[PDB]
From a paper:
Rhodopsin (Rho), composed of seven transmembrane domains, a characteristic of all G protein-coupled receptors (GPCRs), and its covalently bound chromophore 11-cis-retinylidene, is a major component of the intracellular disk membranes of rod photoreceptor cells. Upon photoisomerization of its chromophore from 11- cis- to all-trans-retinylidene, the photoactivated rhodopsin (Rho*) undergoes a complex sequence of structural changes, leading to the signaling state of the receptor, metarhodopsin II (Meta II). Crystal structures of Nb2 in complex with native rhodopsin reveal a mechanism of allosteric modulation involving extracellular loop 2 and native glycans. Nb2 binding suppresses Schiff base deprotonation and hydrolysis and prevents intracellular outward movement of helices five and six – a universal activation event for GPCRs.
Accordingly, we hypothesized that Nb2 binding to EL2 stabilized Lumi- or Meta I-like intermediates upon photoactivation by locking the EL2 plug of the chromophore binding pocket, preventing large structural changes on the cytoplasmic side. We tested this hypothesis by comparing crystal structures of ground-state bRho, bRho*, and opsin in complex with Nb2 to a published structure of bovine opsin. First, crystals of ground-state bRho in a complex with Nb2 were photoactivated by green light, resulting in a change in their color from red to orange, mimicking the experimental conditions where pre-formed bRho/Nb2 complexes were trapped as Meta I-like photoproducts after illumination. a–c Superposition of the crystal structures of bRho/Nb2 (red), bRho*/Nb2 (orange), and apo-opsin/Nb2 (sky blue) complexes at 3.7-Å, 4.25-Å, and 3.7-Å resolution, respectively. Superposition of bRho/Nb2 (red), bRho*/Nb2 (orange), and opsin/Nb2 (cyan) revealed overall similar arrangements. We did not detect any major movements of the binding interface between Nb2 and the extracellular loops of bRho* or opsin compared to that of bRho/Nb2, as the retinal plug formed by EL2 remained in place over the orthosteric binding pocket. The E(D)RY ionic lock appears to remain intact in the bRho/Nb2, bRho*/Nb2, and opsin/Nb2 structures, as no rotation of Glu134 on TM3 or Glu247 on TM6 was observed. We show that Nb2 exerts its allosteric antagonist activity on Rho* by binding to its extracellular domain and preventing the otherwise small conformational changes associated with full activation despite the cognate agonist (all-trans-retinal) being present in the binding pocket.
Residue numbers in the entry:
A (entry chain C), D (entry chain D): 1 to 114
B (entry chain A): 1 to 64, 70 to 147, 151 to 230, 241 to 323
C (entry chain B): 1 to 144, 149 to 228, 241 to 323
Write the structure that this text describes.
């Protein structure tokens, strides 16, 4: 029975920083992949970042290309998103999805208001 | 990402562009050229076009030997393919997506699965049957046939049903026109990882064992009784030759994706051998006319009344 | 308010109820039971199913043999051609439209169905005008082969297109008939803009009456060994070919006139659609005769089949 | 070239009366049927009334059943709608269509405000 925690995030300074978390529960974690996806206040979900099951190859959108950075802990069942040099449009509710999809399991996410 | 995974589906194409949409919602013309979807419907039409007549004549003429029971059993399942599966995929080729819906996909994949498995397990029966006549291990031993043709449906449904149970699932493949077992996503919720093993084990390896187990008995082996034997035991060979030609490519790519899950492969990679393996409906009876002379005579009897 | 007339269409059903919608927009399940639309697709499938194989073998076998160059074979290949134009041009559209329950393809989607339904009947008709003329010239022997036949089979297409093209010109038009699955000439609305009143005359005159004249004109000439066995069976087949054509086309032709006479009257959707779909057997029955009756063909067909 | 005039109509008594007209031009009039159709200010067109080409059988909606009454002049190429004992919901723009359709061919209409 699947359960993704959505820890890390809050109100942050324009041009600040913040580290996100995502504790996975109830599945073979290392056996598949995990993504980060955010909900901008107004427009549809943006696929932020993603990473392979082994964790070898991360991928980012142009929007947060190199500012954000993604990495996962297979042992602990966790996914992180170190967001740096933030902006006002990075203000959104961040969800961590499984597989390769923008389809969000869990929810509430993390309201990272910049 | 390389491919785009969704609840129902997996599109072998990066949504980096933003273009990717569900094949249970919108047409998938970003995957391939829109005329290639028309080419599928063109190809897929002709499978249904020469599917029904060749199988229906072969079904009719037979009812109007163990071999004939099986090659009627195939004419049955080939018509289940044509009307059950091919119809859906010919219509889906038009729209460019499973417009019928998730259950619309299950149809396509189910009778594609029956067709291959009932074709496979029938060649397991044809393998067993000549070994018992040619090598002559049990003396005077050929209603036997009707029991062993019921076997093919028993085992094919062991393969085709469980996706519909919810162990594994049927999922749009390649151009999102055919459907088949989930080789792509681990989908541990569905546990489809384990099924792919079960299928390549119980519904591929075990059959091909018993086939070449019986075929290997006639390595030391290979008047008119044996002419009838020869041409019909030769047809058993040509029937498998065709089955290997047909199903190998798709089976190979299916495993290749299962091995390299999440890797970079295009939509056409899988769809080509998948649609190629849908000739299983038509080629089987064409052999049964072409090679089996006893049938050919009596087919023309029914035709030319 | 018996029927409901629109820009493109005419629905044989009162829009007193408010239910009536265009058959170029929504399915017409208020007209008949939804399973009857499925029954149409079922029927219409089997026309395409036994349409292609019977016609394609008959097309292939005739051309493959360098023999089989008798006027009869030219016509019955010409039909195998037009019957395949029917199957792929017309029947496909109506089999698909039967599914959805309306001309989903659009106004031009209707034109397809009606056009090759019109060619099929006219090329079948004008071919029986040729078969009528040809068996009079040999049997009664008034004027004492290959070139003759090809000229007179080109005639059938010339005249069929005189009939089928003008709807697409904009004189008359193709319009959904009965259950709104088949299409045909506008017998329903006056549509004087289209002038389709005048066309129906032209068609029943030039493309029905004139043919049936020349048919029975030649048939009336023949009121008063083995060459004549070949003659007999093939001149008998000319008869059976017309017998079938009258069986086929009369019902629809009758209802088509009945509506033309009683425009605006009270008639159901099934009234017209039944004889219309019945007359779409023209694609399949023609070659079935050519195999059944013509023995010389049947031999050579099995040659091609059984290599 | 078709031309339908839409004469008769205006502001009228609650429970009043009014006779409408429809001069047809540019077609064989008696070969055609003719209808009346109104546009309520708010909701979709109502098929008011209709009559056969010969003029034999007039047909009305239950909305205006017996209150309204339709008749046509083949000689003069005209269609009339004698509206009697009117109501506030009879307030609409009336069009005269050809054939049997609520498909409205071009006319002024007539804003009969009750
Ligand atoms: C491939 O990549 C594409 C990239 O776009 C991706 O498309 C996006 O898919 C997601 C779904 O996974 C879509 O998200 C939804 O968008 C809804 C609105 O979308 C329309 O409207 C916006 C503008 O508002 C347009 O930009 C857009 O073009 C659409 O026309 C949005 O309403 C959804 O979010 C609401 O619903 C979720 C789910 O229930 C909820 O959790 C959210 O909170 C949200 O509700 C909000 O509530 C507030 C407060 O009450 C309310 O005021 C507000 O209206 C709601 N929020 C919004 C934004 O309206 C959801 O985010 C996304 O739009 C798609 N983008 C586009 C451009 O299409 C594909 O999915 C990918 N394909 C595959 C197969 O992977
Ligand atoms: C059989 O009879 C039915 C009876 O309903 C006909 O259905 C109606 O057809 C008319 C055709 O014009 C439609 O009229 C149009 O309605 C628009 C609004 O309708 C929608 O929105 C309202 C709410 O605002 C709802 O009440 C309604 O249900 C609809 O969802 C109007 O805005 C249109 O006005 C515009 O065009 C007209 C052109 O005549 C102009 O005069 C206007 O100024 C304006 O620009 C228009 O009046 C009507 O809505 C239909 N009703 C239904 C079912 O919704 C069928 O058409 C008829 N079938 C056939 C085949 O003839
Ligand atoms: C999309 O699929 C491609 C394959 O088609 C994936 O590329 C693979 O990426 C991994 C990790 O970066 C590569 O592993 C490394 O490759 C080097 C060089 O070949 C090897 O020496 C190292 O030991 C290491 O294993 C892998 O080889 C590579 N495959 C190829 C052949 O390209 C990629 O992960 C997918 N893209 C994403 C991010 O989804
Ligand atoms: C619908 O068609 C019917 C005929 O099917 C029409 O019925 C005629 O009605 C007129 C009176 O308006 C009579 O004079 C005729 O004798 C009727 N014919 C018969 C014998 O049924 C009817 O007019 C049409 N409906 C409308 C209102 O157009």
């Amino acid at each position: 029975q699947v359960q993704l925690v959505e820890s890390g995030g809050g109100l942050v300074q324009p041009g600040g920083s913040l580290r996100l978390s995502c504790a996975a529960s109830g599945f073979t974690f290392s056996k598949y992949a995990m993504n980060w996806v955010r909900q901008p206040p107004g427009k549809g979900l943006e696929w932020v970042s993603g990473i392979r099951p082994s964790g070898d190859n991360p991928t980012y959108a142009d929007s947060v290309e190199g500012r954000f950075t993604i990495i996962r802990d297979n042992d602990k069942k966790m996914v992180y998103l170190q967001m740096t040099s933030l902006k006002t449009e990075d203000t959104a509710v961040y969800y961590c999805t499984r597989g390769y999809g923008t389809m969000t399991i869990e929810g509430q996410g993390t309201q990272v208001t910049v | 990402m390389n491919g785009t995974e969704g609840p129902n589906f997996y599109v072998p194409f990066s949504n980096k562009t933003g273009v990717v949409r569900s094949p249970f919602e919108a047409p998938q013309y970003y995957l391939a050229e829109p005329w290639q979807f028309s080419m599928l419907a063109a190809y897929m039409f002709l499978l249904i076009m020469l599917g029904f007549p060749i199988n229906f004549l072969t079904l009719y003429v037979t009812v109007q030997t163990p071999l004939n029971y099986i090659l009627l059993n195939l004419a049955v399942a080939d018509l289940f393919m044509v009307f059950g599966g091919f119809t859906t995929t010919l219509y889906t080729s038009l729209h460019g997506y499973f417009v019928f819906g998730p259950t619309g996909c299950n149809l396509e994949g189910f009778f594609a699965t029956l067709g291959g498995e009932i074709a496979l397990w029938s060649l397991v029966v044809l393998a067993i049957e000549r070994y018992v006549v040619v090598c002559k291990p049990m003396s005077n031993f050929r209603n036997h046939a009707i029991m062993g043709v019921a076997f093919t449906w028993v085992m094919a449904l062991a393969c085709a049903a469980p996706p519909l149970v919810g162990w594994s699932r049927y999922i749009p493949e390649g151009m999102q026109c055919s459907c088949g077992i989930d080789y792509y996503t681990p989908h541990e919720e569905t546990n489809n990882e384990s099924f792919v093993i079960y299928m390549f084990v119980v519904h591929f390896i075990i059959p091909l064992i018993v086939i070449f187990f019986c075929y290997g008995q006639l390595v030391f082996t290979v008047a008119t009784t044996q002419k009838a034997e020869k041409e019909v035991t030769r047809m058993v060979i040509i029937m498998v030759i065709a089955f290997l030609i047909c199903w190998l490519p798709y089976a190979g790519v299916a495993f290749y994706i299962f091995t390299h899950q999440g890797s970079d492969f295009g939509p056409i990679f899988m769809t080509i051998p998948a649609f190629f393996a849908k000739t299983s409906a038509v080629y089987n009876p064409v052999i049964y006319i072409m090679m089996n002379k006893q049938f050919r005579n009596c087919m023309v009897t029914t035709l030319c009344c």
